[PDB]
Amino acid sequence: DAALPSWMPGADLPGYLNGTLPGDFGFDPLYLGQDPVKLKWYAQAELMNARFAMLAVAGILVPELLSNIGFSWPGAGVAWYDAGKFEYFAPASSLFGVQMLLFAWVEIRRYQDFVKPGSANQDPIFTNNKLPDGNEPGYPGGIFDPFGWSKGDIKSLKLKEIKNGRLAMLAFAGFIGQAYTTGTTPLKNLSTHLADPWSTTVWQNDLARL
Amino acid sequence: SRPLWLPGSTPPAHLKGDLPGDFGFDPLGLGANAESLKWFKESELVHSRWAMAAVAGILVQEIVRPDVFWYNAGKEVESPLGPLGLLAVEFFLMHWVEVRRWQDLRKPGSVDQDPIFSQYKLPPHEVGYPGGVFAPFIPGDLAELKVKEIKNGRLAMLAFVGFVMAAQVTGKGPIAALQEHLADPWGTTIFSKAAVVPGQAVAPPCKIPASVSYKGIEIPTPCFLQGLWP
Amino acid sequence: VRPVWFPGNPPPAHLDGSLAGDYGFDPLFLGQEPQTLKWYVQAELVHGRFAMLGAAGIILTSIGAKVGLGFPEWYDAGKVVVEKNNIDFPTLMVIQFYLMGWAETKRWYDFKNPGSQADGSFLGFTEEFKGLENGYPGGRFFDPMGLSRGDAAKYQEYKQKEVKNGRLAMIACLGFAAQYAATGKGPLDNLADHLADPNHVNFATNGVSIPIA
Amino acid sequence: RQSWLPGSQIPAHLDTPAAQALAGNFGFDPLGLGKDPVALRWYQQAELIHCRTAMAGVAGILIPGLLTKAGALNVPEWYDAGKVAIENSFAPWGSLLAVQLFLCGFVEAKRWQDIRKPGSQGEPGSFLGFEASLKGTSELGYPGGPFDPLGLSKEADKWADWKLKEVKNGRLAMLAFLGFVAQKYATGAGPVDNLAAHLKDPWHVNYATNGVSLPFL
Amino acid sequence: DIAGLTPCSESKAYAKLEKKELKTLEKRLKQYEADSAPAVALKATMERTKARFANYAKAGLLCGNDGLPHLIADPGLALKYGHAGEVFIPTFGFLYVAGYIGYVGRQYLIAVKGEAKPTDKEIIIDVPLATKLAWQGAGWPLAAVQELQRGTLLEKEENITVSPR
Amino acid sequence: MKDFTTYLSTAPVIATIWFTFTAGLLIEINRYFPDPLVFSF
């Protein structure tokens, strides 16, 4: 290893994590990323779960935030764990069908990029359009990077991405756990913790609940 | 050569006198292993420091607030931060600092650096004696002060054990029991409260109840090793 | 030369003065074969350690029941424990046998293969389970203080003390059993009855031990 | 070495190059059943078929069981589903079993003759061109081709661990079916309901506290 | 209703035999006091008798005109009418154990054939070897089938024969 | 006691021990499961 950051200062890190991935702090106490093929898979899995969890915590909080602020949606005040029972123009059936067809397309595209990097950088129809060569799996760029980032700043930005994404994955785990234990919305849990933080610890609530 | 716990004895071969408080006392040979001796040195230091802080704390609590029994002071504070909020803060803060101390114990060159403000760190020190920001105004030589620390700390360890066993037998605090002994020197010893002979055993009953409420539960409050009490 | 159980009698050739507590006591020549002697050495040590724990526990709980604390006697504590706490005795027994089977199979297959149990198969623990000597596992888990390490003469003295207190505790547990079967009361009740009248209160005055009178 | 008993003497027939290539070789052969290499090959095939069949069946037991404990389905218990499915069916269970035995005997006889001679069903002219895709692969029990749509066997990097995952999940699922059977015979409830009853009171609801497993206790 | 045999739960001679045995036992019991050692013994015997009759009638056994359970040896009649536990199941239960014994002894013989004095390993048993083989003979059917298919169960014409073949 | 355990491994002693074991197993099976005319459990 080296003088890189570490999840535990002084700990003898495993070594196969040597900074080349974003957010490398040596945390692999179960040695799940020991084999480089499993590590190449888990890097992309981390990126994907991370980005989807970031989107999810955004779409759970900022609706909750906009509703507690007092804006008007048809879908305001409906909990994130109750938005499926909500009625829309289509039943959830057709929504899952369309979702899975479209995601089959784009996820098989992403998987073709992962299997053979540099392959899915081209449109079916408009071949004038393409993604810039030299990209990595998980970081397509081009039309996925339209606002003009990735020129410099890229290691800083990848570290930022994976840090916010780990935080968001933990936040979604917390949404699930808090909605299963407290049975309420997450920002209302924040409000009940900020009301009196000393009588609303998880220890306190879980002891009172049994 | 050096003063020993027994002025005529020979210290064990593994106690050469280098350490502070090294008076040749290891009749069981617990510190014979060189790796166990480091851990026991650190445990002696932190036990000494905890016990010194705790003995001073009980004494000063008894002086300032004689209204409260130090043995009962856990269930009599009624702070607005509740029991579990305090317990959580203490758990996490003590976990941080003790894991940091533990990481210095295992790999000593590991943790001298601040994990926030990188410009501040501790100088290369000895394990058990951090220094740096922990030690401003060291008054005099460091070796004699380490000896003083460990001696006052052994005394304070015995003093806290004495607080406990004189608060379970007498039910009174340290200075209250001291005044109880000064008001009756020949009748308030443990020899004058207790005696076992081949045919009967008189033990002092505990003045501590076996259980206390503390907010809707019943905390078991047992005497330390009653039964083995004389 | 060396103290023998029967002074004057030469010790048997297979009991060299090397094992802890070697007094040349093998009239039935049960440990004449070396591998059988290693097996019996570990058996003696396990028996004696379990018996030391048992004598200590019986003595402590008898002290507690004698001074008036909330303690049953050793012959009544199982029922009291499984009935005070609503503990299913089958569940407790099978948990005990699961855990003790893990531990004792590790024992067995370190006896059969001393080099074993230190490959890192259990949980990555290699050196905590390699074993120092036969019957003396050692390491950071079984010898956390390192008392086998460091001073060797102290280690031999401790081996002697261990085996001797173990034999004494085995005799003591046999005595607890026989004293319950004879007097029908606790060990320290027996001791207090003996200290009350040392004469007229002993095994010769139960009618059980000596049936002549 | 990755043994089942770290201190055991592993049988010499499971330490051979021909046996250490087999998936999930932890030296477990206390009865010496695979001391014959031909018997070891045949029993490796039997282990693979049992493990895949048990994986499929135990999934079909506990996945729909978990989904009917969660309301997503209303599948009856696995010890009741045959009667329920045959009372809603187009056929008696006899004709069903006959069609099933014919269709299964065909493919299992093909698998049999491939075990007898590896790569023999690719004899040209046997099927209608499909025999080309029935030669199997270099490894027996891992046929590939039409049985491998996603092409996950064409790596030679994840292949050993794919094997290991298969055989380990399959041994686990075989144990799981044996447990379904024993738990039905000892409790009279479903496997997921057994899990629930154990998770609501583990220290008084287990095999030590039913009247069947330990009559002495 | 297999061979004119009535179930023992419906036969009256079966109940007659039960009450006859119990009458014998209680006529012996009348001689002793309430809880004697003989009284305890005879009450236990009566309980064993009632339990035995209940457990034979519960097992679907067929009885004759004498009220005695008759076993069905035929597979096909035992499996059609639920009498497989009489002769059919214990058949394979026995054959497993008998092949166990034979296979274990065979393996012991074959293993001691290699030693310099194979005869003294038969009057003085190699107990560790014998126990190893006794434990690993639980899979005797599979091992026997696989030894049959290799042609190594049988000896060829190296066995000895008399002069007229 | 290598010779004593060689004696105990003799055909008559081993036969006695093994048949005491088998007979005791059958006797205990017939005590705890009395009168087993048929396989019904």
Ligand code: CLA
């Ligand atoms: C495949 C794994 C598996 C799992 C997860 C379970 C789980 C369970 N079983 Mg089942 N069981 C299994 C296999 C399994 N069993 C097998 C193979 C048998 C036949 C011997 C049984 C026979 C059986 C009976 C007769 C009963 C249970 C019962 C139970 C429940 C309580 C546990 C108990 O009493 O001890 C389980 C009993 C055993 C003899 C242990 C067998 C376990 C085997 C060796 C595999 C698992 C070991 C593995 C190393 C650790 C767990 C793996 C897990 C993380 C996947 C629990 C839900 C009880 C129940 O219904 O309570 C509500 C009950 O009465 N089980």
Ligand code: CLA
């Ligand atoms: C060859 C003729 C023959 C046959 C077929 C039988 C058959 C029987 N006799 Mg009769 N008997 C015979 C000759 C015969 N006997 C003779 C010659 C005598 C005079 C000495 C007697 C005297 C006699 C009496 C006095 C009694 C019997 C009884 C029985 C029954 C025994 C049931 C039993 O023990 O369950 C045993 C059940 C088992 C399952 C045991 C099988 C063996 C092992 C344990 C199975 C293996 C399990 C497992 C794999 C082991 C793992 C390893 C292990 C080391 C842990 C059975 C109907 C008894 C009875 O009730 O009859 C109705 C009875 O009371 N017999």
Ligand code: CLA
């Ligand atoms: C993203 C991190 C995150 C954050 C900020 C919170 C915040 C909160 N949680 Mg949630 N929670 C989380 C993750 C998180 N949780 C996860 C992953 C789980 C699953 C185990 C839970 C399960 C859970 C339950 C069951 C309950 C809460 C509750 C609470 C509230 C009181 C805190 C408490 O009692 O201790 C909860 C603390 C934990 C469970 C420890 C998780 C710590 C995470 C993993 C790392 C924290 C990051 C960093 C070190 C510190 C924060 C930095 C930054 C966010 C400022 C508070 C609003 C309680 C509530 O509703 O209050 C009213 C409550 O009952 N949480």
Ligand code: CLA
């Ligand atoms: C008189 C008792 C006695 C003595 C002298 C020893 C001595 C020894 N043991 Mg043994 N041992 C004993 C009892 C004893 N043991 C018992 C009862 C157990 C079962 C728990 C063991 C289990 C055991 C294992 C598994 C191992 C040893 C090892 C050792 C060696 C190194 C440790 C040492 O120096 O111990 C010195 C002992 C003392 C100074 C005695 C301390 C006095 C105690 C604390 C009195 C109070 C007892 C209390 C009432 C009940 C305690 C409960 C318990 C669960 C903690 C040394 C030869 C290790 C070894 O050989 O390393 C190579 C090793 O691996 N022993």
Ligand code: CLA
């Ligand atoms: C650990 C040693 C020990 C100690 C300190 C005591 C102490 C006591 N016992 Mg107990 N006892 C012991 C061992 C011990 N016993 C053993 C091993 C047995 C079984 C034989 C008994 C059986 C027993 C009974 C039945 C009774 C007592 C009683 C008593 C009390 C009065 C003494 C008496 O009656 O003589 C008993 C003294 C002995 C039996 C001798 C002590 C043990 C010897 C020295 C062991 C020698 C073993 C030897 C070295 C090797 C054996 C093998 C060899 C034959 C080849 C007293 C409190 C009585 C009581 O309750 O008092 C009211 C009573 O009724 N004891």
Ligand SMILES: CC(/C=C/C=C(C)/C=C/[C@@]12O[C@]1(C)C[C@@H](O)CC2(C)C)=C\C=C\C=C(C)\C=C\C=C(C)\C=C\[C@@]12O[C@]1(C)C[C@@H](O)CC2(C)C
């Ligand atoms: C195939 C299998 C299970 C298949 C299950 C299926 C099809 C289930 C089907 C259904 O449920 C569904 C789906 C839906 C239901 O409505 C209908 C049915 C039809 C009921 C289990 C095998 C299960 C097989 C098992 C449990 C085998 C266990 C073998 C062991 C333990 C062997 C051990 C040893 O042999 C070794 C390894 C080495 C030796 O040296 C030592 C010993 C010890 C002898």
